[PDB]
Structure formats: C-alpha cells, structure tokens
Design a protein around this ligand. Structure first.
Ligand SMILES: Nc1ncnc2c1ncn2[C@@H]1O[C@H](COP(=O)(O)OP(=O)(O)OP(=O)(O)O)[C@@H](O)[C@H]1O
Ligand SMILES: Nc1ncnc2c1ncn2[C@@H]1O[C@H](COP(=O)(O)OP(=O)(O)O)[C@@H](O)[C@H]1O
Ligand SMILES: [Mg+2]
Ligand SMILES: [Mg+2]
Lengths: 203, 528, 571
C-alpha cells in the first residue's frame, strides 16, 4: 500500500474529501492539522463529531467526548470557517444493548436530555453523500457508527455502499481498522491491509 | 311460493301486492325468464320495473309473482370473451360455446372500495392517439371523460383506446346504452378484424330495450370488470354513453312517482353516477392487485358544458377530453380541443421517457394557436414569431392521424423529441414524410433485434438527454435520412434539410443492399 | 430556577418539541456548518439557503420575533395549563329509548314508524339499524306525527328493508374527538379510513350539530379580523393578503397546479406557525384522497393534520356532514386546547350540491336553477362558525369549483357572500408556464388596506397592479404593431411589467422532489423589497430569463453577476 499512500498524497485529484471516522478527536488531530491543508471538505464521523457539537453549544447529554479537544475544535472552527462537515440527523438509543433507534422529528441537531447518540441517520447520510459524490477522491478510515450492534452500524454500511457505488474514476483509500472490517464484510480502489500504515503516513 | 300478485299495470310498471320485506332494487321473479327490480315499496305493496320480456307470458292483473329477497347478481361465464351479451348474461352474439357453469355470481350494486384499498396511478394506458398519449396522459386506474357534441369522434377515440391494447394484457369491456344494433355489430366486426376479439366483451342495451336494462347495463359491465380485477387483471371499460343512462334513470323515476328536480331529473342522479365511477382505480396487492380504467362518454348540445349531467360528470372524473365541432369542421382528425382538455394525473401517468419527451408541448401549442388566430389581423411578424408558427404547424401536422390508427407509445415519444429538436420542419405541409417516418420508426422498434432492445430500454428506464442524443444521432438519424432521401427526392435541394443533416453518417449503400434483399423499409443493423 | 424541577412538568413529547425554541446567539450561529444551518433552517420551516450570511440573518430575524421570543422564554419555566373558557362538552350518556321499524323504502329516503318510546322524538336525531354485522345511521328529517318520521341514510343504504328494527337515543350524530385524531383519516361519522383493522380513535364523543352556547348574545363575542397570515408565497403575501380568522376562496384548478398550493399552505402553517391543520374533504375523490394522505405521510405534515374525508361515492348526507364535522374538529382544537387551526374545505360547490340533493330528495320545492330554498341559510350555518376569539383564530382556506365559469350561479354568489379574500387561478398562466399560476389582476383581498398593512406595502401593491395592467394592455399592441411602434416610456413600462410578472413565480418546497430544485419561503419584507427594486428599473439590464422561478432579488443579481463574470473570464 506504498503506492496508494504516496501517489494519492503527493498528486491527489483535487478536489478531494476526507472521512475521518473515529472515537476521539485527539486520536487523529495530527492528520487533521495536515488534512486542514490537504483538503477543503472534511467529513467527521464518530464521537469526534459529538465533541465538535459539544464545542458548538449543542446539547449532547453524556456522549463520550475529548473535553480537552473541545476548545481546540472550537478554535479550529473559528479559524477555519468552511472546512468541516458535521452530521445533522442521528439514530439514538438511551442504552447500548442493541436498542431500537429513536429519531428526532424536529430540531434534529439537538440531542435531548437523557439520550445519547450512536450513529448518523438518513438525513446525515444524504448530507455526506452530496459531499462525497461532489468530490473526486476519498480516504475513508472510520466507522462513523458503532459496529458492535446492527442498531448503530447501518450508517457505516450505507456510506460504504454510497462510496462503492460512485461510478467513474473516484480514487479510494483506507486508513481505519473498523473501516477495513466493514469493507471486508461488505464484499475501495486499493484498501490498505493495515490502517496503521496510512495513519503513520498521514500523521 | 308466489307471495305477490299484480294489481295494476301503468306505464310499463307492475304494481304488486303482498306481505314481504321489500328492499330497494330487489329482484322479483314473474317467471323463469322474466324478472324485475323494485323502485318503491310500502309495508304491503311495491312498484316494479321489468328487465326483459317473453312472448308467451302475458302479465295481467291477478298474475302471481315471487319475491326473491336478494338484489341482482350477474353470473360470469367462460364465453363472455368475444361475445355480445345482455345485462342478464344471455349471449346475443358468441364465438365459443358456453360451458353452462357460472365461474362466479357478482352483485351489480357493490360499494366502491375505500381509501386504504387503493394504490398510486403511475402506469400508462396506451391510447394509440399521439395527442392523448403526449399531452393528455391516461394512467391505468384513471377516469378520463370524453365529452363533446354529436358526430365529433368520441366513439372513435374510445375504440382506438381499445384497439391499442392488441398486444397488451388489458381486458376490454364496451358497454353500450341506448345505441343502435347496427353500430354495435359494426364495432363487433371492427374488434374481429383488428384481432382483439378474444379479449373484448360487449354489454348491450339498445334503445329498443327495457328502460331498466338500459339503467343496469353499466353496473353489470363494471361488475364483470371487478370480477376480472379481483384476479389481478387490468381492465379498460368504456360507457357509451352516460347521458342515455341518465335519461333512462330519469324516465324510471318520473314514471315511479319521484318528485322532479333540476331538468326533471330525480334528486339522486349525481349519487347514481358517482357511486358508479368510483369503483374504478388501481388497487393494492391484497385487494385484488389489478386496476380498472374507465372512459365515460358525454354528449353536449351546441358545446354547452353547463348542463346538469355534464357538470356532474366533469365533477366526478379525473380529466376531460373535449371534442370540438369547430375543429371538426376545420379538417382536424381527431378533433380534440387541447386547450379545453385537462388531465389531473399529468406526467405521473406517463413513462419517464415519455415524460421527458413531451415536457413542453402545451406551451408550443398555446402560443401557436394564439399566433394563428392573430395572423389574420397583423402585418409585421417577428422572426421568433415566424419560427414558432413553423414549429406549431409542424406539431399540428404531427397529431393528425387516421381513423382506427394505432401509433405506439415510444413512436410518439420519438416524434415529439424530433419535433422539439428541429428535425421535423424541412417539409412544407406534406404528410407522406410523417407517414414514412412513422413506418420506419415502427419497423425499427418492432422488426429488429437491436431496435427491440432499444424499445425495451425506452419502455422500462428513463434515460437522460446525453444518451438520448447518442441514440438519435447514431442510429435513428442516419436511417431516417436515407429513407427520406430515397422516398422524398426534392428534399435534398432544401437548404434546411441539408443544414441540419450534414453531421450525420451516410448509410445509403448498406440499406440499399438490405432493401434489395427484400427487407422491410426501416430495418437496420441485421447482425442475425 | 432548577431545570430538573421544570422537566418534571413537560411531557417527553413536550420537551422534544421545546428543543425547537431554544435560542442560538449570533456567535453560536456562526460556528455551524452550512448543512447544519440548512437543517436548522428547515426545522424552523424557512426552506433552504446556500448562502451562509443570508441563512444566519434569516435565523436571527425569525429568532428576533415577538411570538418566537415569548415561546422560547415559556420553554424554560414549568408547564402552564391552558384553563379553558367556554369549552366543548361531551355528549350525555343515555340508553336507547326509542324503538321502531322501517315501513316505507325509497332511494335514500326511509320512513320509520316508532313502536316503543319513553320520550318524544326530536328533529335531526339518529336511528341505528344493525344489519349483517354492520350499523347504519338514519338522520331524522320530518316528524309527520307522534309515531312517524322520515330519514335519510348516512353512508350506504344496502341491507335496509321493510321491517328492519331501528333504535335511537334521541340524540344527534356524534364522533370521537381528541388530540389523538391528529394524524388519522376518518369520515364524517367517525369511521376509520386508513387501515383494514380500523384501529380505534381515542377521545370523547361530541355532537357536531350542537353549538353549546349559553345564549345568542354569546355568538356576538367575536373579534373582528385584524391580523394577516403569512404564507411565504410572494403573490399571496404581497397582492392577496390572507386574513387571520377569516375566509379565503381558492377559486379554480385543473392542471393549474392547485394541489401544490394546498399542500404548500398546510406545510407552511404546520411548520412556520406551529399550528394545527384540519382538512375536511367534501366530495373528495378516492384517488385524490389517497394521494393526499400518502403525500402528507411523505412530506411529514401528516402527524399534525386531521383528515375528514366525505367520499364522492357516499350518500348526500355524509357529504353534507363532512364540513360540519371538520368545523367541529377545529372548534375542539381551538376551544379546548387553545391552538390556532387552519381549516381546509374541498369542495364548497360539492357541499352546496349535496345540500341541494338532500333537499330535493325530501320533496321540497326547488328554488332558482333547481337549488334548495335554504341554500344561503345552509351556507351561513357552515361559515359562521369559522371566527376568531380570545382562545385562538380559526382561519379557513376554501376551494370552490365554478361550473362553466358562471360567477352568477347561486352557489357561487352564496360562497362569495362570505369570502374575505379570493385567489383566482388562471388556466392561461398555467399554460404559459407561470406558477403558482395566480392571476394578480382579477383577484383581490379585503386585507389590502391601511387598517392592516404599511403604506409602503399598499403603494407597492397598487403600483404593481397598475404596471401589470398597463403591460397587458401594451402587449396587444406589441403583438399586432411591433416593439418599435411604442414610445420609450411604453417600452420601459413593458420591460418593467415583464420583470414583475416573471418575478412573482416561485418554486415550492413540497415540489422539490419533482422539480429537483430546492424550494423557497420568501418572507414578506424580502418580497416587498424585491418588488420595490424591480419597480425602480434597477435590474432592467438583466435579461428576463434570469427572473424565472427564483427566491429573492439578491439571487437574481448574484446569478447575473456570476454568469456575466464567467462569460468574460472565458473571453
Ligand atoms: N380520426 C378520424 N379520422 C377520420 N374520420 C374520423 C376520425 N374519427 C372519427 N371519424 C369519423 O367521424 C364520424 C363520426 O365519428 P364517431 O361515430 O366516432 O362520432 P361520435 O361523436 O361518437 O358520434 P355520435 O354522436 O353519432 O355517436 C364518422 O364518420 C367517423 O368515421
Ligand atoms: N410546477 C408545475 N409544472 C407543471 N405542472 C404542474 C406544476 N404543479 C402542478 N402541476 C400539475 O397541475 C395539476 C393541477 O391539478 P390539481 O393540483 O389536482 O388541482 P385541481 O384539483 O384543481 O385539478 C396537477 O395534476 C399537477 O400535475
Ligand atoms: Mg358515438
Ligand atoms: Mg382537487
């Protein structure tokens, strides 16, 4: 995966998109600092999006977030005003044991009291689909959702099907272990076997 | 046992006495071949209208009658297809012998199925008329009234809608109320000639027949249609016409003793017609899964759509096809008034390819007609106005088709796209060019191995503009150009004919070799 | 004080709803992605905006509104109970006290002879006949003597025969009403029309024919119309203002895109005004009713709309009772819950026709054109309960069919006696490709006056109407003589009028599934400013083709600048 990591980095087909799926913001901040200069549209998936929302004066409840990275994300938003994409619609469950999703009919951006988010919903799916179809190349490396149970894994499968159904000449990269598992289970132009290699390359 | 006896006979109505639990439209049996329905009833008396007649039976005062206690059911026999029958199921004309066992017995006065039993109307019903297919679409499950004056081609329009279903899974039911037997026999012969007899039924109630039979004819016909719909079939029903049905009901009510209303009709004429034209539509898979399309016909007097019955029918139906006497006198056939006509279903009732092909025809027709009317008063006409007059004349020539002529749906879509793209303007009031083009396209999309696949993709999928442009400019345009040049000779000298046709291949030699081999004019790409 | 104490009052649905009214500051608004801003704007019912600055300004302007700030402040304090004044009361509980049998039958009219009764029969009461495991309601019409009544069916008359036993409580027809009715489809007599199992509607029984007033004087405690309802549609907002608590007649249709008009209106009232909607479909086509129900489910305004469909195939009595049932549902939603209601009638002409049919069936001498003698009184009975009080406003949009375009028909005259505003849809404009196809010349509204609008709005509307009329007059000269046969002033007037005509076109939100272009919701001030700028000729250099189906004047200016710049860039 040396070619897919080097050629797609030195001479990427701009415009490009970044799909950073992860559990913590601090987890992939460096790639972001870099991606803040490599690309213009940035899709954030996982609890990093929840950290962004908590930085954005939005009720989240008790979803896990890097409170130390909250102020850093807010400052990044202040400096970079059109370099982030955040989900709007979610499929929420109070518990974690494969609970049926609860949908917010009105003012979906706000997480209610006592509720916590697990996966992005169909409207967020469409919002991200527009951006990925608009762009040229992708670096999918995150299960924006929770793969532990199917109640919060349909978002990652949906985004994977959307990216894999983009007919044309769209270049694709892989940088996530859970993304690798999702790709293997689904049945990318060249998905790196190990996401750690791409993570170190983009670090 | 005969528990009723006749006491008076006035105005062909039978007054019967006896103790019974009478119901509205209950069947009373006067013999094994004579029966009637109940109009009004006391606790011990009833008024009955007879449905048929017997030469041997002479109904008099004192005759005995039997009250069945149930409303009228029509039986379904296997030889209804390809036959002309009564409202009692007797075969007047037949092509196959009857098995003498009823498939089912269906109430003729059922209630229309409710809202939760329906499904969206989204599949075209191929009428076979270019203007109706393109500008006034009809879906499967729609109610499209055909309204106009006497002798303007409404029956021909309905007959064309039935003949266009030759190669289709749609069962035709033609109900004639108060029509002539000569016309009905002519329609039967037309069905036999065009090879739709094996799938078409005729329910006849001529003007000579009993008024109650002319009243019940549409109900029995649509009960048969509902029988066919219950097993997932698509049914197309024509009522010819509903004004005679309304007149028959008015006569029945006035003779029974019902108080007159506006235009001397009974007070429930609207409910009579509306309860009939609401049991037709598309139904969900668990409620039969089929559909019933209806094409009722209405006659107006001197183009007055303000009458009671025409107003009710316009209020009930999903759209109207107006036939104009003025347009008929101007040579237009079929004389369909596109301005007055409306179709509430719209594009939803078309295919995606046809919805794309016929996007902006209404504006073209409207401004063309306006400029045509004003052309007799102006002197200075703009270049844009001249160009739109030219395009409008082309469109008006396009939709002029002969009687009993079926033009296929994709052919109409292709002709619309050719009109909008400018390749239907070189001629000068010449029709043979359109006939040749239609024949070439029909044999291309029917008598071919690649044209068949192109027809299938046009039927099933909605393509974008780019691949359509490739389709037109790579196969349709060269073939059409060669055939037009071979048939129309002088067209080469036309500047506009060659200005638009310079960037199209010259397939003359291959197609000349094809036609020398004896192939039909328009087949191409014989890779078989 | 304590959010925890407050949360114990609001129900889960109530807090979820109150998440809408939470306010975001300008700094808070700034730190949003454009899709987040679009989602928040959509949730507040203001369409879509690609520009970030305009979207933020619109959200701030809506937030900086008296109603919005009141409802946001009330979202923090504990729940306040709406204590009703003059509420609707349920029907009295009774046993069946009158018993008789059918002695004369006809088409839709049945005569009942009372056998055993503990109390005297009252007019307009309902008899119940149970046949083949189904009940049939017969409304009393005339009482000939102590033991004989005439009745007409409410529904299907199949199965009624001489000797059928009927029992009555000596009460009018009643239906179950509650907040649970919101989101379901029923008919005038309460029967379920959206699932085979017929899941019951929970609520209290109410009689739609009983007004329940202390005295006649109570009917005169009514607020005269003073407010204007905003719709986000440029033509209606500018030239045809809609009264709040009044009546608006949507006269026209048929291929003019009327359906989109009623959908857009229901959606705008459900979202932008946070109101309740009642749709009473009188003489409703089964296909059109099914399609409207499915589209309401698909666009997400079903859950706040109550559907009462009197179908075309039912008896005249049920089609008559449809409007009364709708009015009763609206009255329940306003008097008992305090919520403003938008009542929809379709069609008024069919309600008049059903009344005429019933009157003719009961052997009453017809009036002019065969109509019923009590046509105007029936129209008053329907239309005088759509009023405005302290509890809330019931504003009604009524669609009428004019048969053969005869505005002198008695039904049209009777309806015009009550319409505070009229919106006339033109088939010619629909053919021309102008949507929403509302003719701004022959339509008018009584709220376009100094008592309700700013003088700026009045002058803008008058100038627009005069300009459009002059342009229409000059277009004939254009068609006959030519563009070079006019004066310079007339040329300028023609160009300004063409720009004004094409600016009033608008793409609707509920239609973006088909058009594929996002719909718009133009606020009144923005449309007023756009028309003011267009009237001044400040955009006469732009070709008219850029004015078709746009949101605001700023969009026209930006698109023209973009196109021209890019043109020059290539050059
Ligand atoms: N497309 C057509 N091209 C040529 N002739 C036509 C066409 N359509 C109808 N006609 C002719 O017009 C005449 C009247 O047609 P048709 O019988 O359908 O009219 P109608 O409106 O049903 O009349 P009626 O009131 O007598 O029942 C016939 O002579 C028929 O052949
Ligand atoms: N923007 C549009 N462009 C073209 N056609 C439209 C548009 N909007 C609506 N229509 C069509 O106009 C027709 C109007 O009929 P409808 O909305 O049912 O009103 P009515 O009930 O008065 O006939 C619809 O069937 C619809 O297909
Ligand atoms: Mg005829
Ligand atoms: Mg309608």
């Amino acid at each position: 995966e040396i070619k897919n990591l080097d050629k797609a980095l030195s001479r990427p087909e701009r415009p490009i998109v970044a799909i950073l799926g992860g559990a913590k913001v601090s987890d992939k901040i460096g790639v972001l600092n870099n991606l803040l200069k490599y690309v213009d549209k940035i899709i954030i998936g996982g609890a990093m999006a929840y950290t962004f929302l908590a930085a954005q004066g939005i009720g989240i409840g008790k979803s896990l977030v890097e409170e130390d990275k909250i102020d850093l994300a807010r400052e990044y938003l202040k400096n970079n005003l059109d370099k982030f994409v955040l989900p709007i619609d979610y499929a929420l469950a109070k518990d974690f044991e494969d609970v049926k999703p609860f949908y917010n009919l009105e003012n979906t951006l706000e997480i209610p009291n006592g509720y916590m988010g697990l996966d992005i919903g169909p409207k967020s799916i469409e919002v991200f689909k527009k951006y990925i179809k608009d762009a040229k190349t992708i670096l999918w490396n995150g299960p924006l959702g929770v793969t532990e149970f199917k109640y919060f894994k349909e978002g990652t499968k949906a985004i994977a099907k959307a990216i894999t159904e983009l007919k044309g000449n769209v270049y694709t990269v892989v940088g996530g272990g859970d993304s690798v598992a999702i790709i293997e289970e689904l049945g990318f132009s060249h998905v790196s076997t190990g996401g750690g290699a791409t993570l170190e390359f983009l670090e | 046992m005969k528990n009723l006896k006749i006491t008076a006979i006035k105005d062909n109505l039978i007054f019967v006495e006896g103790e019974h639990q009478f119901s509205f439209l209950e069947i009373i049996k006067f013999s094994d071949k004579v029966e009637g329905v109940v109009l009004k009833a006391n606790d011990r008396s009833a008024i009955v209208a007879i449905l048929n007649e017997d030469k041997d039976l002479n109904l008099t005062v004192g005759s005995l009658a039997e009250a069945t206690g149930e409303l009228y059911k029509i039986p379904i026999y296997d030889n209804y297809l390809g036959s002309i029958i009564n409202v009692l199921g007797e075969s007047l004309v037949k092509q196959y012998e009857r098995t003498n066992v009823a498939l089912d017995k269906k109430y003729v006065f059922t209630e229309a199925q409710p809202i939760f039993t329906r499904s969206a109307v989204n599949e075209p019903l191929v009428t076979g008329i270019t203007v109706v297919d393109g500008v006034l679409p009809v879906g499967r499950g729609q109610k499209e009234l055909i309204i106009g004056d006497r002798g303007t081609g409404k029956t021909a329009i309905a007959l064309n809608a039935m003949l266009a279903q030759e190669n289709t899974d749609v069962i035709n039911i033609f109900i004639a109320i108060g029509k002539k037997r000569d016309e009905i026999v002519e329609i039967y012969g037309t069905f036999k000639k065009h090879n739709i007899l094996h799938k078409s039924i005729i329910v006849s109630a001529a003007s000579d027949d009993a008024v109650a039979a002319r009243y019940l004819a549409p109900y029995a016909g649509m009960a048969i249609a509902e029988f066919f719909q219950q097993i997932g079939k698509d049914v197309l029903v024509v009522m010819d016409d509903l004004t005679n049905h309304a007149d028959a009901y008015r006569e029945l009510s006035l003779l029974a003793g019902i108080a007159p209303a506006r235009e001397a009709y009974p007070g429930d004429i609207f409910y009579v017609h509306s309860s009939l034209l609401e049991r037709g539509g598309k139904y969900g898979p668990e409620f039969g899964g089929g559909s019933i399309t209806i094409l009722p016909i209405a006659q107006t007097l001197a183009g007055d759509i303000s009458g009671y019955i025409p107003t009710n029918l316009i209020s009930i139906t999903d759209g109207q096809i107006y036939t104009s006497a003025k347009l008929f006198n101007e040579g237009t056939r079929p004389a369909i008034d596109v301005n007055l006509s409306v179709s509430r279903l719209g594009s939803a009732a078309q295919s995606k390819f046809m919805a794309f092909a016929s996007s902006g025809l209404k504006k073209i027709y409207t401004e063309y007609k306006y400029l045509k009317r004003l052309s007799s008063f102006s002197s200075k006409i703009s270049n844009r106005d001249l160009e739109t007059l030219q395009k409008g004349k082309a469109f008006e020539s396009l939709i002029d088709q002969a009687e009993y002529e079926v033009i296929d749906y994709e052919t109409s879509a292709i002709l619309f796209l050719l009109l909008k793209k400018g390749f239907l303007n070189f001629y000068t009031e010449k029709t043979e060019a359109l006939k040749v083009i239609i024949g070439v396209i029909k044999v291309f999309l029917a008598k071919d191995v690649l044209g068949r696949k192109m027809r299938a993709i046009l039927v099933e999928h909605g393509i974008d503009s780019i691949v359509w442009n490739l389709y037109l400019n790579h196969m349709i345009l060269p073939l059409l150009k060669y055939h037009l040049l071979s048939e129309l000779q002088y067209l080469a000298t036309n500047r506009e004919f060659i200005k638009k046709f310079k960037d199209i291949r010259n397939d003359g030699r291959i197609l000349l070799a094809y036609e020398r081999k004896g192939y039909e004019r328009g087949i191409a790409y014989d890779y078989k | 004080l304590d959010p925890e104490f407050v949360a114990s009052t609001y129900t889960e649905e109530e807090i979820i709803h109150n998440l809408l009214f939470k306010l975001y500051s300008v700094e808070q608004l700034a730190l949003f992605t454009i899709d987040q801003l679009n989602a928040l704007l959509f949730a507040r019912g203001l369409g879509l905006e690609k520009n970030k600055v305009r979207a933020i300004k619109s959200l701030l302007t809506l937030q900086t509104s008296y109603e919005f700030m009141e409802k946001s402040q009330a979202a923090l304090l504990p729940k306040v109970s709406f204590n009703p004044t003059n509420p609707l009361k349920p029907i009295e509980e009774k046993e069946f006290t009158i018993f008789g049998e059918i002695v004369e039958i006809r088409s839709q009219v049945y005569k009942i002879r009372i056998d055993k009764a503990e109390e005297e029969v009252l007019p307009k009461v309902i008899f119940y006949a149970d046949v083949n495991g189904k009940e049939i309601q017969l409304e009393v019409a005339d009482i000939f003597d102590k033991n004989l009544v005439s009745t007409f069916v409410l529904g299907n008359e199949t199965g009624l025969k001489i000797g059928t036993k009927v029992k009555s409580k000596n009460q009018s027809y009643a239906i179950k009403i509650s907040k649970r009715l919101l989101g379901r489809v029923i008919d005038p007599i309460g029967k379920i029309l959206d699932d085979s199992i017929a899941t019951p509607v929970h609520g209290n029984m109410y009689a739609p024919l009983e007004m329940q007033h202390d005295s006649e004087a109570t009917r005169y405690v009514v607020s005269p119309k003073n407010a204007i309802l905003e719709t986000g549609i440029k033509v209606i907002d500018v030239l045809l203002p809609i009264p709040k608590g009044g009546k608006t007649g949507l006269l026209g249709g048929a291929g003019v895109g009327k359906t989109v008009i009623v959908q857009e209106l229901i959606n705008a009232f459900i979202k932008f005004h946070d109101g309740v909607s009642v749709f009473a479909g009188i003489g409703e086509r089964i296909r059109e009713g099914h399609e409207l129900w499915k589209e309401a489910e698909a666009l997400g305004f079903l859950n706040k709309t109550a559907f009462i469909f009197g179908q075309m195939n039912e008896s005249p009595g049920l089609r008559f009772r449809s409007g009364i049932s709708g009015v009763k549902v609206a009255e329940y939603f306003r008097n008992n819950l305090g919520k403003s209601v938008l009542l929809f009638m379709d069609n008024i002409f069919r309600y008049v026709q059903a009344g005429s049919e019933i009157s003719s069936l009961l052997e009453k001498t017809p009036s002019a054109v065969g109509y019923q003698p009590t046509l105007f009184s029936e129209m008053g009975q329907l239309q005088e309960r759509i009023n405005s009080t302290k509890d809330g406003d019931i504003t009604s949009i009524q669609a009428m069919y004019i048969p053969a375009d005869d505005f002198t028909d008695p039904a049209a005259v009777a309806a015009f006696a009550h319409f505070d505003s009229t919106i006339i849809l033109s088939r010619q404009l629909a053919a021309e490709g102008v949507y929403p196809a509302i003719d701004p010349l022959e339509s008018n509204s009584k709220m376009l006056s100094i008592k309700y609008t700013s003088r700026e709005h009045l002058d803008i509307a008058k100038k627009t109407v005069q300009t459009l009329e002059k342009t229409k007059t000059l277009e004939d000269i254009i068609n006959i003589l030519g563009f070079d046969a006019l004066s310079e002033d007339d040329k300028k007037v023609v160009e300004v009028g063409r720009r004004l005509k094409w600016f009033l076109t608008q793409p609707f939100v509920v239609a973006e599934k088909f058009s594929g272009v996002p719909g718009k919701f133009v606020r009144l001030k923005d449309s007023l400013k756009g028309i003011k700028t267009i009237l001044d000729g400040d955009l006469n250099h732009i070709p008219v083709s850029y004015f078709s189906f746009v949101g605001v004047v700023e969009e026209i200016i930006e698109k023209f600048n973009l196109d021209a710049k890019k043109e020059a860039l290539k050059n």
